[PDB]
Structure formats: structure tokens, C-alpha cells
Amino acid sequence: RGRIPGRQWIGKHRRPRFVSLRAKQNMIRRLEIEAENHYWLSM
């Protein structure tokens, strides 16, 4: 049981990927950096 038709991560019916908690934090950490980059590029 539990077959994903074809290849896992391509096509119409893919294996679902879920967002963990550290993946969210990792992205937010990047955003806070680039938001401060906008501030120093403004003067």
C-alpha cells in the first residue's frame, strides 16, 4: 500500500511535502536580513 504513481516528486500526482517548523523559521531568518538590506540601500 501507499504507492505514488510514477516518480515521486514530478508529474500530476506527486508525493505531498509538508512545511516543518524550522523550515518556516529558516525562511523568516532570511527575510529579516534582506529587510535590513533595504534600509541601508535607502540612504
Binding site: K12, R17, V19, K24, M27, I28, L31
Partner: peptide, 25 residues
């Protein structure tokens, strides 16, 4: 591949899925 408009909800790129999760009310 698949068109941009589909009868079924189309699976997102993982980077987009993460974006939608950070930008939640």
C-alpha cells in the same frame, strides 16, 4: 506538464508552499 489552470488543485513548488505558510493571517 500541466497547464496553469487545472480542474484539480495543482501542487505548488516547495518554496511557494513555504511562502504561503509564512504569510498566514
Amino acid at each position: 506538464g500541466s497547464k496553469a489552470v487545472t480542474r484539480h488543485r495543482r501542487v505548488m513548488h516547495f518554496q511557494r508552499q513555504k511562502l504561503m505558510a509564512v504569510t498566514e493571517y
